[PDB]
C-alpha cells in the first residue's frame, strides 16, 4: 500500500492513529482534602522543574 500511494497514485501516504479521548479529572480544588499527594500531578502538564520569576 506504500507502493500504491507512492508509485501509481502519486501522493504521500496518509498515516492515521487511533486517538483515545483525554482522561476525565474533576475540577481542581484549593484544598483537596484527604486526596493523596499525587493529586497535584493530575492537573499539571509539564514534568519538569519550573522556576517562576527567578
Amino acid at each position: 500500500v506504500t507502493y500504491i500511494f507512492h508509485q501509481l497514485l502519486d501522493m504521500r501516504e496518509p498515516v492515521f492513529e487511533f486517538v483515545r479521548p483525554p482522561p476525565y479529572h474533576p475540577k481542581q480544588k484549593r484544598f483537596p482534602h484527604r486526596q493523596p499527594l499525587r493529586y497535584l500531578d493530575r492537573y499539571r502538564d509539564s514534568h519538569e522543574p519550573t522556576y517562576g520569576i527567578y
Binding site: 484549593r30 484544598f31 482534602h33 493523596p36 499527594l37 497535584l40 492537573y43
Partner: protein, 95 residues
Amino acid sequence: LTYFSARKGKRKTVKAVIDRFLRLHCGLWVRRKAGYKKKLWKKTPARKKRLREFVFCNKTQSKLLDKMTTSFWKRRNWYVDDPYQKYHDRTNLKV
C-alpha cells in the same frame, strides 16, 4: 499558643505542628495518616495502601495550622534535591 513571648514579645510556633505536618508554599498542609504503622497484621492491603499515603489537609485544618506556626515556616525554601519541590507552586487552577 503564645501570642506574645515574655522575652521577645513575638509569636511562637507550636512545635507539635512542625513535628507532624508539612507546609507547602501554596498553602497546603501535607500529613501522614493516623495509624499507618499500627496493627498492620489485621488490615487489608487496600487499607494499608490507603494508610501509607501523604494526605492533604482541610481548609480549616490548614488555617488552624497557619495560625499555630510563624512566618519562618511559610517561606520559600530552595533545597538541593527536595522530594516535595514540584508540589510547592500550584499549577493550572481555575480558582
